[PDB]
Design a protein around this ligand. Structure first.
Ligand SMILES: [Cl-]
Ligand SMILES: [Cl-]
Ligand SMILES: [Cl-]
Ligand SMILES: [Cl-]
Lengths: 174, 174, 174, 174
């Protein structure tokens, strides 16, 4: 069973398993975004790379939560993973707007879990989120917000031109 | 406007702007202390260097707060910067006593902001202060306290001798 | 008191202290400009970097004046530092126009002090300004003028596009 | 005769020859100071080294003036060199006080020559002094003033102790 568990509430254990599901769902959403931008009829390499990187980051976040669950003596429980909300993701702008929505939802889940940890007097959990998740999320949301502003200023009356230039001159590509 | 702000209270935003002012004021105080000890009629190089270093440290603390303000989606607001409390700073002892007073005031402002963060359930802010400010301040206050004790033991009946020896043998100089 | 002062007028001493205030004010203005361009709703990294660099340059100019004040046996006297003239700085164009205004004001103050030095038969002061300030200021004003022309030619009927392209292709960024 | 002389007044030529004499006299004074501090009954190595270095510096200043005299097409004219004002130089304090007097006299001679150059519309001469002499002299006087303050604070009621400590802990020695 366990022999190590100490100060680790059933409420936190369940919430961690839920958060793993949310991160894996987010990873799957980013996988879909990445491959949409690799379509020959979309063909925005830097946009593809941006979202493929996020798919890996979210998977790694789920793995870190699972490692922690076992370190505390809780039990990983996996649930079905829903498919992403869209099959096609529109423009770079549409995609970046969907990404910031998704990140705000993950951030709120992190904050909710931090608040649960405080309520449960679980300082290890609170430390864990502060150390590996909260600032990573703030940094990423700031980056997306920066990108949104630049994408928006490039729409002008020549959306295609602006979308190409943003991909070429802001996003990382070969 | 903002598109990134989340869980970032107006109260914290304002308090961060106030703390920026306090750090910039402290930086200005240390600039004045540094140049006083470079006067030809004062001429204590190690004391000059000690306070010039602190002027840079406090400026960098203000810059880190400003970076964080933008990362969270708050808005930097700058106010007039008051001049330092003195134009001449007395002996090394007088200066180190003024410095520890100043640092206690910064430390209390940090603690007040940490308490506001806890009240507002803002774990990112609390993490931020713990990571970059609270221990730096404890370390610095301990160092100043150590220096005060050594300065005090050197006063004896030969203050000039003790002030020279402390500058030469404790403080870093060329 | 002093034992080193020679050929260093009270008029120059006071004017140097005033010029220190002007440089520190300019540094503060550039700090504000830099952080405005780091806002997520502005997000022009190269513009941010340009003005953050100038904030450091102006601080260093103030420090060089203070060092010189002590080398000549004058006494640094610090005054309150007024906040910058604006809290928000508009477009890159608006900001660069404000910067060239500011630099012209610093340049005129330098020239006024050079003329005072000549009047007071203070060749060390005149040398000092020529060596460390006058050409640095001419170079910087020429650079800003160059930038203004390029910004202006990019406005066209697509201001957002031009502002992005200038930041990407002229200014230094990561 | 000359074939190169241009814009080089007889007044400046004579004043340069006088200044050469003043620098060589100063060099001789420092030679005497250096060897006094090497006496077995004085024995302050760092003080000896300080003044021996200045003897070389003043000789080199005289050589630079002579080189310039020939570059401009003037004619070096050498006069008798008076012996130093003292045969024995007292304490480190007495010596440093005599040195700052001497340096103030050289500085005034430099300033007088700079003013003569301006009067004669001789910008090469004015540049020459600014480039190689005026700031070197300000720097040296500031250093001596710094030393005087430290020597004075060490007198206390134990002059011998203070004189030893200054030599050991401020001045450069083997
Ligand atoms: Cl579904
Ligand atoms: Cl005040
Ligand atoms: Cl104001
Ligand atoms: Cl004689």
């Amino acid at each position: 069973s366990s022999q190590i568990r100490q100060n680790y509430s059933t409420e936190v254990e369940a919430a961690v398993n839920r958060l793993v599901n949310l991160y894996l769902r987010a990873s799957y959403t980013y996988l879909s975004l990445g491959f949409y931008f690799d379509r020959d009829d979309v063909a925005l390499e830097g946009v593809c790379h941006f979202f493929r990187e996020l798919a890996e980051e979210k998977r790694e976040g789920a793995e870190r939560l699972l490692k922690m669950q076992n370190q505390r003596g809780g039990r990983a429980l996996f649930q079905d993973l829903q498919k992403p909300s869209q099959d096609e993701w529109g423009t770079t702008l549409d995609a970046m707007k969907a990404a910031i929505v998704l990140e705000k939802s993950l951030n709120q889940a992190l904050l909710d879990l931090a608040a649960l940890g405080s309520a449960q007097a679980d300082p290890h959990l609170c430390d864990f989120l502060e150390s590996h998740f909260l600032d990573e999320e703030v940094k990423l949301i700031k980056k997306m917000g920066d990108h949104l502003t630049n994408i928006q200023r490039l729409v002008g009356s020549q959306a295609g031109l602006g979308e190409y230039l943003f991909e070429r001159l802001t996003l990382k590509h070969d």
